[PDB]
Amino acid sequence: ALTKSQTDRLEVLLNPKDEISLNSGKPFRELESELLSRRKKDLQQIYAEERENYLGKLEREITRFFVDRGFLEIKSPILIPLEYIERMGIDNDTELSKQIFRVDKNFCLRPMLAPNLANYLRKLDRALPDPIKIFEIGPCYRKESDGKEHLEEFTMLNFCQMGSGCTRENLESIITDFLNHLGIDFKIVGDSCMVFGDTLDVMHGDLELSSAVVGPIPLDREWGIDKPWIGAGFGLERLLKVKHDFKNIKRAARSESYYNGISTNLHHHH
Amino acid sequence: ALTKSQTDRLEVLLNPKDEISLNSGKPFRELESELLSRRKKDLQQIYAEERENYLGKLEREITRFFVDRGFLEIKSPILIPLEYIERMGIDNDTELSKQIFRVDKNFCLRPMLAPNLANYLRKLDRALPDPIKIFEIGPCYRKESDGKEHLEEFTMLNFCQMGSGCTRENLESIITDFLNHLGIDFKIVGDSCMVFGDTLDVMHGDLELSSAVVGPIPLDREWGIDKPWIGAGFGLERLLKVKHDFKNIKRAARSESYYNGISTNLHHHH
Ligand SMILES: Nc1ncnc2c1ncn2[C@@H]1O[C@H](COP(=O)(O)OC(=O)[C@@H](N)CCCC[NH2+]C(=O)OCCc2ccco2)[C@@H](O)[C@H]1O
Ligand SMILES: Nc1ncnc2c1ncn2[C@@H]1O[C@H](COP(=O)(O)OC(=O)[C@@H](N)CCCC[NH2+]C(=O)OCCc2ccco2)[C@@H](O)[C@H]1O
Ligand SMILES: [Mg+2]
Ligand SMILES: [Mg+2]
Ligand SMILES: [Mg+2]
Ligand SMILES: [Mg+2]
């Protein structure tokens, strides 16, 4: 019989495609040696052939998709003023407020892309023709209980449009074209959150890929926005989790422990 | 005569290619209106044509260069254990130690990529053939006096090789092939730093593009490295500064104030 420590170690080395059972009586060593060989060969093939990191590669694929559809690529600060949190309507006694990583006294790691993108929409409206279409991909941060679907350090895509064409129909059509491009099935369900109000959540089974919003909303005034807008935020690690059938989202994260979902800890267990 | 406030505002709107003088007596308005028109047209053309962010585009170009030359693309954590700082030989009473953004009690924003990459080298050595070649591009953080050449939030490339081929000659040859690819002239000068010891600094005039190291070094033991290695770190914003002849590195940074070196603040000054 395998101990919990042993079972945990074999789970680390097991990949979704494997058809190997941890409950069929084989000694821990036979199982560990088999899996280590498979994972070493997996890394050897990546190194010999493509050499691209899944998170980087997905960012690049997504970037191409939105640039080709007329959206401006944004790269904004990750370390942001703490004041942006308050101004997003996140009161400091709320749950999301307790998820913020504070830095020094007056800054934080951004938990979302929206405030920076709201500032870009306002500013670009002075220069660009209608409709204004922009997107950003990059790191975001939230203190979490984690579990299998949450990370403290994750990667968000947020695209948005402001001016004409900002209807629920167009928003759903963009989401549909995007997830069709990635080859991911989904449904849309109505939900709500404290910050934006009513949302359209993009679901893969019970897993939330995205929350999306059809503006305008009352918050807009605080960011100097006064036109219709639509936008959606997606977690890249969640997209990878679905695409590669990972059981735990940690396999898709920035990590020292996994590379393209393959364990980097290829020592023997004792 | 222009006030300091006026001169500063016009400097924000001026771009390197402009042949417009702020010292030839024209009223502030004539100058401000001219520059605003140029910058709006610059943004309009980016939006109509390419839509790519310089920092993102450069990351993608660099990634392709190193992947095609046999280096594995790494995406590791930005938020790292504070203990990694100590173990890099950065004592807490040193100057670099005072540049660290601490997060909670036991973490920090990484000020460099090396510790994460050292862990990857050690781990991948259990799986990959000689030589092991890896690189990472991403955000790094240092409290700075700033000025025209430093940012608190910047983007580093670090490539490294471990095993065979880890000579000064090969390191210089990679650096040369890389900067030749980017179309940037440079020289190499010997320097030294507290962490790695003797370095080879890659200079464009008086501007440091990179520090590079030929190992092994005594620090290696603390990271479980015991083979020869070579590596170099480059700032992407510094590369952009040179490529686009920016006067201030802030034009190349993740920002809400500049997009591809063009001011996003296109209001009228009073
Ligand atoms: N902990 C953790 N780990 C992994 N993935 C995670 C995660 N937490 C979230 N995700 C993934 O991100 C997606 C979106 O997160 P969310 O909390 O549901 O939604 C928001 O953060 C929100 N900002 C998304 C965009 C809403 C539309 N708003 C917008 O476009 O604003 C644009 C500009 C503007 C105008 C006025 C105001 O702002 C999760 O679904 C998950 O995948
Ligand atoms: N504040 C600020 N703003 C803009 N750009 C900045 C900046 N500070 C630095 N830069 C740019 O980064 C380049 C490198 O920074 P550095 O301090 O000179 O050098 C280092 O950080 C160092 N880690 C670079 C790599 C050295 C080689 N080491 C390595 O490859 O390790 C690999 C693994 C290993 C094995 C054993 C131990 O580790 C600046 O030149 C500037 O452009
Ligand atoms: Mg949540
Ligand atoms: Mg949601
Ligand atoms: Mg320095
Ligand atoms: Mg240096």
XYZ file of C-alpha atoms and ligand atoms in Angstrom:
628
model
C 0.000 0.000 0.000
C 1.192 3.529 -0.784
C 1.529 6.182 1.872
C 0.059 9.637 1.405
C 3.591 11.008 0.830
C 4.162 8.434 -1.883
C 0.807 9.012 -3.571
C 1.414 12.772 -3.540
C 4.834 12.311 -5.150
C 3.445 10.113 -7.906
C 0.638 12.650 -8.536
C 3.305 15.337 -9.113
C 4.919 13.157 -11.770
C 1.699 11.992 -13.418
C 0.498 13.861 -16.497
C -3.035 13.971 -17.938
C -2.173 11.831 -20.980
C -0.651 9.026 -18.905
C -2.670 5.836 -18.612
C -0.958 4.650 -15.444
C -2.782 3.638 -12.267
C -1.538 4.489 -8.765
C -4.056 2.054 -7.224
C -3.020 -1.240 -8.866
C -0.549 -2.550 -6.295
C 2.753 -1.889 -8.105
C 5.610 -0.941 -5.739
C 6.240 2.799 -5.296
C 9.638 2.468 -7.011
C 8.375 0.836 -10.206
C 5.823 3.589 -10.497
C 8.260 6.397 -9.640
C 10.898 5.143 -12.052
C 8.388 4.800 -14.882
C 7.011 8.308 -14.407
C 10.421 9.926 -14.042
C 11.493 8.385 -17.350
C 8.365 9.704 -19.072
C 8.803 13.209 -17.703
C 12.535 13.361 -18.556
C 11.687 12.306 -22.106
C 8.931 14.928 -22.216
C 11.415 17.672 -21.254
C 14.008 16.308 -23.657
C 11.509 16.535 -26.520
C 10.460 20.099 -25.661
C 14.127 21.101 -25.535
C 14.957 19.399 -28.802
C 11.933 20.652 -30.718
C 9.859 23.736 -29.816
C 11.395 25.228 -26.645
C 8.475 27.592 -26.011
C 6.852 28.090 -22.626
C 3.079 27.533 -22.684
C 2.279 30.746 -20.878
C 4.527 32.808 -23.137
C 3.279 31.077 -26.263
C -0.383 31.580 -25.303
C 0.267 35.293 -24.580
C 1.801 35.604 -28.062
C -1.115 33.781 -29.731
C -3.671 35.932 -27.932
C -1.756 39.101 -28.738
C -1.795 38.244 -32.456
C -5.534 37.530 -32.349
C -6.449 40.921 -30.848
C -3.934 43.031 -32.770
C -5.243 41.515 -36.027
C -8.794 42.454 -34.976
C -7.968 46.088 -34.447
C -7.143 46.214 -30.729
C -4.142 48.234 -29.492
C -1.623 46.240 -27.370
C -1.087 47.865 -23.957
C 1.734 47.223 -21.453
C 0.971 49.091 -18.263
C 2.387 49.075 -14.752
C 2.027 45.985 -12.537
C 2.896 47.954 -9.425
C 0.067 50.491 -9.139
C -1.183 53.130 -6.734
C -3.148 51.767 -3.824
C -5.566 54.645 -4.527
C -6.724 52.859 -7.696
C -8.185 50.060 -5.549
C -10.362 52.496 -3.575
C -11.435 54.289 -6.762
C -12.540 50.982 -8.353
C -15.093 50.841 -5.534
C -13.218 48.206 -3.539
C -13.848 49.284 0.080
C -11.078 48.317 2.503
C -13.351 46.136 4.652
C -14.359 43.936 1.695
C -13.053 40.513 0.800
C -11.314 41.518 -2.425
C -9.651 44.300 -0.454
C -8.115 41.654 1.823
C -6.696 39.935 -1.264
C -4.451 42.890 -2.153
C -0.670 42.573 -1.932
C 0.424 45.926 -0.545
C 3.806 47.340 -1.447
C 5.323 50.063 0.685
C 2.573 52.322 2.025
C 0.884 53.656 -1.085
C 1.227 50.964 -3.763
C 0.113 47.440 -4.474
C 0.440 44.652 -6.990
C -2.474 45.059 -9.380
C -5.251 42.476 -8.749
C -6.803 43.279 -12.145
C -6.082 45.259 -15.317
C -9.211 47.419 -15.419
C -8.048 50.613 -13.736
C -4.999 51.020 -15.957
C -7.133 50.258 -19.018
C -9.793 52.767 -17.915
C -7.083 55.458 -17.822
C -5.923 54.407 -21.294
C -9.457 54.585 -22.690
C -9.940 58.107 -21.331
C -6.608 59.275 -22.678
C -6.758 57.621 -26.086
C -10.233 59.080 -26.640
C -8.487 62.405 -27.121
C -6.543 60.956 -30.102
C -8.080 57.871 -31.672
C -11.122 57.376 -33.897
C -14.281 55.598 -32.804
C -14.398 52.829 -31.619
C -11.416 52.637 -29.294
C -10.249 49.026 -28.917
C -7.439 48.036 -26.551
C -6.202 45.008 -24.618
C -3.540 44.010 -22.140
C -2.078 40.691 -21.037
C 0.043 40.385 -17.939
C 0.622 39.482 -14.329
C -1.989 40.110 -11.673
C -1.956 39.241 -7.961
C -4.497 38.179 -5.311
C -4.047 36.528 -1.903
C -6.068 33.333 -2.275
C -6.958 30.142 -0.415
C -5.661 28.729 -3.702
C -6.974 25.238 -4.260
C -7.047 23.732 -7.738
C -8.429 26.742 -9.652
C -6.756 29.807 -8.025
C -3.243 31.168 -7.998
C -1.789 34.105 -6.084
C 0.270 35.087 -9.129
C -1.699 34.713 -12.351
C -1.904 36.206 -15.871
C -4.915 38.122 -17.141
C -6.069 39.150 -20.584
C -8.467 42.103 -20.564
C -9.826 43.475 -23.834
C -12.225 46.359 -24.076
C -13.969 48.575 -26.575
C -15.435 52.053 -26.072
C -17.787 54.040 -28.295
C -19.815 52.428 -31.042
C -20.371 48.683 -31.206
C -20.548 48.252 -27.434
C -23.478 45.866 -27.248
C -23.987 42.541 -25.482
C -24.246 40.944 -28.918
C -20.880 42.247 -30.095
C -19.212 41.340 -26.780
C -20.519 37.776 -26.971
C -19.438 37.590 -30.610
C -15.864 38.591 -29.742
C -15.732 36.108 -26.890
C -17.090 33.405 -29.216
C -14.556 34.183 -31.969
C -11.748 34.168 -29.398
C -12.567 30.902 -27.674
C -13.365 29.291 -31.015
C -9.825 30.334 -32.089
C -8.346 28.684 -28.998
C -10.527 25.590 -29.489
C -12.284 25.866 -26.136
C -15.973 25.075 -25.581
C -17.966 27.294 -23.268
C -21.285 28.701 -22.136
C -22.310 32.132 -20.899
C -24.163 32.604 -17.619
C -25.362 35.740 -15.880
C -23.624 36.571 -12.597
C -22.760 39.656 -10.548
C -19.811 41.098 -8.653
C -19.288 43.950 -6.193
C -17.129 46.031 -8.519
C -18.842 45.994 -11.923
C -22.341 44.860 -11.012
C -24.008 42.463 -13.413
C -21.635 40.345 -15.466
C -21.622 37.698 -18.127
C -19.481 34.824 -16.907
C -17.821 32.595 -19.449
C -17.877 29.050 -18.083
C -16.198 25.779 -19.050
C -18.242 23.397 -16.958
C -17.969 24.726 -13.408
C -14.744 26.621 -14.188
C -14.911 30.386 -14.797
C -12.737 31.402 -17.748
C -13.835 35.031 -17.764
C -16.071 37.745 -16.373
C -17.368 40.261 -18.924
C -19.286 43.528 -18.601
C -21.530 45.633 -20.807
C -21.225 49.259 -19.747
C -21.899 51.984 -19.054
C -21.886 51.622 -15.279
C -21.959 54.165 -12.444
C -18.242 53.586 -11.689
C -17.358 55.107 -15.069
C -17.623 58.661 -13.776
C -14.849 58.086 -11.258
C -12.466 57.258 -14.155
C -13.680 60.035 -16.441
C -15.405 57.613 -18.807
C -18.731 58.720 -20.259
C -19.245 56.561 -23.351
C -20.585 53.023 -23.781
C -18.009 50.281 -23.370
C -17.699 46.488 -23.258
C -14.904 44.401 -21.835
C -13.844 40.961 -20.636
C -11.103 39.521 -18.478
C -9.714 36.005 -18.899
C -7.181 34.039 -16.861
C -4.495 32.499 -19.099
C -3.653 29.766 -16.608
C -7.327 28.753 -16.579
C -7.304 28.624 -20.385
C -4.198 26.404 -20.241
C -5.811 24.212 -17.554
C -8.693 23.509 -19.912
C -6.592 23.126 -23.025
C -4.165 20.664 -21.463
C -6.595 18.996 -19.035
C -4.510 19.794 -16.001
C -6.024 18.693 -12.689
C -4.413 21.560 -10.777
C -3.941 25.066 -12.081
C -0.431 25.158 -10.558
C 0.697 23.157 -13.617
C -0.012 26.197 -15.809
C 1.504 28.906 -13.563
C 4.755 30.794 -13.507
C 6.713 28.311 -11.479
C 9.927 26.716 -10.472
C 8.074 23.397 -9.905
C 6.545 22.802 -13.349
C 7.543 23.509 -16.916
C 4.743 23.214 -19.442
C 2.932 21.072 -16.869
C 5.895 18.726 -16.357
C 7.450 18.444 -12.915
C 10.926 19.974 -12.660
C 11.602 17.970 -9.481
C 12.991 14.818 -10.953
C 14.907 13.486 -7.952
C 14.146 10.152 -6.280
C 11.792 10.126 -3.282
C 12.784 8.485 0.020
C 10.094 83.550 -22.757
C 8.898 80.107 -21.659
C 8.490 79.174 -18.030
C 9.950 75.972 -16.641
C 6.422 74.479 -16.512
C 5.924 75.309 -20.169
C 9.310 73.972 -21.257
C 8.681 70.748 -19.328
C 5.299 70.305 -21.020
C 6.757 70.801 -24.481
C 9.562 68.313 -23.672
C 6.893 65.691 -22.856
C 5.347 66.205 -26.287
C 8.608 66.387 -28.230
C 9.862 63.218 -29.902
C 13.424 62.409 -31.011
C 12.639 62.697 -34.736
C 11.090 66.159 -34.412
C 13.121 69.065 -35.742
C 11.349 71.689 -33.656
C 13.112 74.189 -31.399
C 11.789 75.232 -27.979
C 14.289 78.127 -27.841
C 13.306 80.120 -30.952
C 10.790 82.542 -29.459
C 7.522 81.033 -30.750
C 4.611 81.405 -28.292
C 3.950 78.409 -26.019
C 0.591 77.801 -27.734
C 1.931 77.586 -31.288
C 4.472 75.083 -30.083
C 2.002 73.088 -27.966
C -0.578 72.924 -30.736
C 1.993 71.793 -33.292
C 3.339 69.024 -31.068
C -0.087 67.797 -30.002
C -1.080 67.433 -33.656
C 2.075 65.439 -34.399
C 1.589 63.117 -31.445
C -2.125 62.530 -32.181
C -1.196 61.635 -35.755
C 1.546 59.338 -34.456
C -0.974 57.453 -32.284
C -3.508 57.388 -35.099
C -0.950 55.749 -37.395
C 0.060 53.125 -34.819
C -3.615 52.305 -34.278
C -4.366 52.102 -37.972
C -1.310 50.065 -38.919
C 0.727 47.883 -36.529
C -0.884 48.205 -33.073
C 2.009 46.510 -31.262
C 3.557 47.814 -28.063
C 7.334 48.286 -28.316
C 8.077 46.445 -25.110
C 5.865 43.507 -26.050
C 7.188 43.412 -29.596
C 10.826 43.490 -28.436
C 10.140 40.658 -25.937
C 8.678 38.609 -28.807
C 11.639 39.344 -31.110
C 14.144 38.424 -28.413
C 12.228 35.275 -27.533
C 12.350 34.119 -31.167
C 16.090 34.810 -31.360
C 16.954 32.661 -28.323
C 14.468 29.853 -28.955
C 15.854 29.507 -32.501
C 19.376 29.254 -31.044
C 18.519 26.391 -28.757
C 17.615 28.171 -25.510
C 14.577 27.045 -23.481
C 12.026 29.828 -22.723
C 11.408 30.163 -18.970
C 8.539 31.975 -17.202
C 9.224 31.996 -13.490
C 7.735 33.790 -10.508
C 8.066 37.580 -10.168
C 7.120 37.465 -6.507
C 9.928 35.444 -4.909
C 11.112 34.404 -1.469
C 13.024 37.070 0.382
C 15.440 34.249 1.293
C 16.674 34.179 -2.318
C 18.105 37.690 -1.865
C 20.227 36.611 1.119
C 21.356 33.452 -0.688
C 22.513 35.494 -3.717
C 25.007 37.065 -1.311
C 23.105 40.338 -0.974
C 23.654 41.257 2.701
C 20.838 43.307 4.235
C 23.078 46.291 5.021
C 24.161 46.685 1.378
C 22.894 49.167 -1.163
C 21.217 46.650 -3.463
C 19.497 45.250 -0.384
C 17.929 48.678 0.195
C 16.585 48.577 -3.366
C 14.342 45.569 -2.674
C 10.559 45.932 -2.724
C 9.417 43.746 0.153
C 6.046 42.050 0.026
C 4.470 40.784 3.215
C 7.177 39.538 5.576
C 8.924 36.817 3.615
C 8.653 37.767 -0.067
C 9.802 40.444 -2.450
C 9.543 41.560 -6.041
C 12.505 40.010 -7.829
C 15.282 42.570 -8.543
C 16.901 40.158 -11.023
C 16.236 36.835 -12.759
C 19.354 34.942 -11.681
C 18.137 33.044 -8.631
C 15.134 31.545 -10.399
C 17.335 30.655 -13.375
C 19.957 29.072 -11.093
C 17.230 26.788 -9.699
C 16.150 25.918 -13.246
C 19.711 25.074 -14.283
C 20.145 22.738 -11.309
C 16.836 21.028 -11.944
C 17.067 20.716 -15.715
C 20.544 19.199 -15.375
C 18.790 16.082 -14.132
C 16.917 15.800 -17.476
C 18.505 17.665 -20.366
C 21.596 16.975 -22.469
C 24.741 19.080 -22.366
C 24.849 22.067 -22.755
C 21.820 23.399 -20.915
C 20.666 26.692 -22.454
C 17.813 28.732 -20.981
C 16.552 32.315 -20.886
C 13.845 34.421 -19.319
C 12.380 37.830 -20.091
C 10.195 39.660 -17.626
C 9.546 42.271 -14.992
C 12.097 43.099 -12.332
C 11.991 45.736 -9.581
C 14.481 48.014 -7.789
C 13.969 51.168 -5.707
C 16.017 53.741 -7.612
C 16.886 57.438 -7.618
C 15.666 56.973 -11.192
C 17.011 59.701 -13.423
C 17.165 59.227 -17.181
C 18.570 55.669 -17.265
C 16.845 53.851 -14.340
C 13.324 52.673 -13.698
C 11.814 51.112 -10.585
C 9.814 48.704 -12.748
C 11.852 47.396 -15.670
C 12.123 44.320 -17.934
C 15.148 42.042 -17.988
C 16.369 39.410 -20.402
C 18.749 36.893 -18.830
C 20.168 34.055 -20.916
C 22.555 31.463 -19.606
C 24.339 28.294 -20.590
C 25.773 25.565 -18.356
C 28.161 22.736 -19.207
C 30.254 22.737 -22.348
C 30.836 25.879 -24.385
C 30.935 28.173 -21.356
C 33.875 30.337 -22.349
C 34.365 34.101 -22.513
C 34.706 33.727 -26.277
C 31.358 31.987 -26.696
C 29.626 34.446 -24.341
C 30.957 37.424 -26.293
C 29.954 35.725 -29.541
C 26.357 35.284 -28.360
C 26.180 38.873 -27.173
C 27.602 40.022 -30.522
C 25.121 37.935 -32.548
C 22.260 39.242 -30.403
C 23.061 42.935 -30.565
C 23.938 42.625 -34.243
C 20.416 41.160 -34.711
C 18.882 44.145 -32.923
C 21.091 46.571 -34.875
C 22.776 48.051 -31.812
C 26.456 49.035 -31.661
C 28.388 48.315 -28.499
C 31.674 47.700 -26.738
C 32.653 45.383 -23.905
C 34.434 46.658 -20.804
C 35.578 44.851 -17.686
C 33.767 45.799 -14.475
C 32.842 44.181 -11.159
C 29.846 43.889 -8.856
C 29.254 42.684 -5.298
C 27.133 39.696 -6.285
C 28.917 38.005 -9.196
C 32.403 39.464 -8.917
C 34.134 40.314 -12.168
C 31.816 41.078 -15.063
C 31.874 42.000 -18.701
C 29.725 45.083 -19.159
C 28.131 45.697 -22.516
C 28.180 49.444 -23.145
C 26.540 51.757 -25.679
C 28.554 54.884 -25.049
C 28.197 55.546 -21.323
C 24.979 53.499 -21.097
C 25.138 49.950 -19.700
C 23.020 47.561 -21.767
C 24.097 44.436 -19.910
C 26.288 42.821 -17.284
C 27.623 39.364 -18.170
C 29.515 36.729 -16.188
C 31.793 33.807 -16.968
C 31.446 31.224 -14.215
C 32.089 29.236 -12.217
C 31.999 31.469 -9.154
C 31.997 30.725 -5.419
C 28.269 31.586 -5.142
C 27.447 28.552 -7.294
C 27.664 26.152 -4.365
C 24.841 27.914 -2.550
C 22.525 27.137 -5.515
C 23.771 23.590 -6.042
C 25.559 24.480 -9.274
C 28.908 22.807 -9.890
C 29.500 23.093 -13.639
C 30.868 25.927 -15.783
C 28.300 28.481 -16.880
C 28.010 31.800 -18.721
C 25.198 34.305 -18.619
C 24.132 37.870 -19.361
C 21.355 40.193 -18.296
C 19.996 42.996 -20.477
C 17.431 45.711 -19.778
C 14.802 45.882 -22.544
C 13.924 49.497 -21.810
C 17.602 50.404 -22.224
C 17.659 48.578 -25.565
C 14.565 50.543 -26.637
C 16.133 53.808 -25.408
C 19.067 53.228 -27.733
C 17.035 51.961 -30.651
C 14.590 54.861 -30.611
C 16.978 57.547 -29.322
C 14.825 58.393 -26.348
C 16.275 61.036 -24.027
C 14.608 59.533 -20.957
C 14.144 55.849 -20.303
C 10.601 56.525 -19.019
C 9.550 56.683 -22.694
C 10.287 52.955 -23.017
C 8.708 51.758 -19.737
C 5.446 50.143 -18.796
C 3.461 53.301 -18.357
C 0.235 55.168 -18.370
C 2.096 58.324 -19.533
C 3.699 57.092 -22.767
C 2.773 54.661 -25.497
C 5.627 53.645 -27.762
C 7.396 56.809 -26.601
C 4.436 59.071 -27.417
C 2.811 61.058 -24.632
C -0.679 59.851 -23.707
C -1.410 63.190 -22.006
C -2.749 65.146 -24.907
C -4.720 67.809 -23.043
C -3.976 71.534 -23.287
C -1.685 73.097 -20.672
C -2.737 76.185 -18.687
N -6.630 33.879 -8.207
C -6.786 33.644 -9.581
N -6.074 32.687 -10.224
C -6.204 32.393 -11.509
N -7.003 33.079 -12.307
C -7.774 34.070 -11.752
C -7.700 34.376 -10.389
N -8.580 35.384 -10.149
C -9.155 35.699 -11.326
N -8.673 34.901 -12.305
C -9.073 34.854 -13.694
O -9.342 36.308 -14.197
C -10.562 36.342 -14.691
C -11.187 37.733 -14.422
O -11.111 37.970 -13.011
P -12.435 38.508 -12.368
O -12.257 38.852 -10.946
O -13.667 37.678 -12.644
O -12.793 39.835 -13.183
C -12.110 41.058 -13.102
O -11.047 41.123 -12.585
C -12.520 42.173 -14.068
N -11.642 43.262 -13.932
C -12.461 41.572 -15.482
C -12.776 42.631 -16.571
C -14.267 43.103 -16.455
C -14.556 44.057 -17.596
N -13.963 45.348 -17.228
C -13.112 46.031 -18.112
O -12.988 45.662 -19.237
O -12.717 47.330 -17.765
C -12.134 48.006 -18.831
C -11.970 49.491 -18.508
C -12.998 50.169 -17.590
C -14.003 51.063 -17.964
C -14.686 51.460 -16.745
C -14.077 50.813 -15.676
O -13.064 50.051 -16.199
C -11.336 35.219 -13.991
O -12.474 34.815 -14.727
C -10.225 34.184 -13.912
O -10.093 33.528 -15.244
N 16.699 50.253 -12.426
C 16.886 49.756 -13.724
N 16.193 50.248 -14.780
C 16.351 49.848 -16.033
N 17.164 48.856 -16.352
C 17.917 48.289 -15.354
C 17.812 48.720 -14.027
N 18.681 47.980 -13.289
C 19.279 47.112 -14.129
N 18.823 47.298 -15.388
C 19.252 46.633 -16.599
O 19.522 45.128 -16.285
C 20.753 44.854 -16.667
C 21.364 43.797 -15.714
O 21.257 44.312 -14.381
P 22.564 44.184 -13.527
O 22.355 44.610 -12.131
O 23.806 44.764 -14.161
O 22.931 42.629 -13.544
C 22.240 41.613 -12.866
O 21.166 41.814 -12.411
C 22.664 40.164 -13.121
N 21.777 39.291 -12.468
C 22.638 39.960 -14.645
C 22.970 38.497 -15.035
C 24.455 38.159 -14.664
C 24.762 36.758 -15.154
N 24.155 35.831 -14.193
C 23.319 34.788 -14.623
O 23.221 34.532 -15.781
O 22.909 33.845 -13.671
C 22.345 32.716 -14.256
C 22.165 31.602 -13.226
C 23.170 31.492 -12.069
C 24.177 30.538 -11.914
C 24.832 30.821 -10.649
C 24.204 31.919 -10.071
O 23.207 32.303 -10.931
C 21.519 46.181 -16.620
O 22.674 46.161 -17.435
C 20.412 47.106 -17.103
O 20.312 46.991 -18.586
Mg -11.975 35.453 -6.743
Mg -15.545 36.525 -12.069
Mg 22.003 49.675 -10.252
Mg 25.679 46.060 -14.213
